[PDB]
């Protein structure tokens, strides 16, 4: 109707345990019953993105590296996080509060 959205850009360094989260998404592989976009469902209590970075399960990814993850496979969204070498740059989507 009359309700609009607000976007956030975060920069992370590649973790010793494997960052401190897990990602559900695909073009050929589903989550709910045949999915187009990549969404959050698993968070770790002692990782690098939960304590040092500032990412929550309710934040959801559109773009990774400044690269197009809106229409890709599961292995094609993990190879943007494992191949960058030491520095990974993520773009998230969240709805506007009344106060």
């Amino acid at each position: 109707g009359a309700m609009e959205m607000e976007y956030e850009e975060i920069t992370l360094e590649r973790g010793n345990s494997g960052l401190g989260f897990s990602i559900a998404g695909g073009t050929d592989n589903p989550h709910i019953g045949d999915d187009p976009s990549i969404f959050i469902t698993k968070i770790i209590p002692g990782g690098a993105a939960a304590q040092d970075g500032r990412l929550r399960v309710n934040d959801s990814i559109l773009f990774v590296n400044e690269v197009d993850v809106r229409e890709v496979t599961h292995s094609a969204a993990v190879e943007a996080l494992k191949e960058a070498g030491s520095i990974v740059r993520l773009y998230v989507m969240r709805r506007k509060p009344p106060a």
């Binding site: 494997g18 960052l19 989260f21 897990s22 990602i23 559900a24 592989n29 589903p30 989550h31 709910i32 019953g33 469902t41 698993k42 599961h74 969204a77 993990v78 996080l81 494992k82």
Partner: peptide, 9 residues
Amino acid sequence: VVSERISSV
């Protein structure tokens, strides 16, 4: 749920 896997970075 029905078709998932999840275990990623």
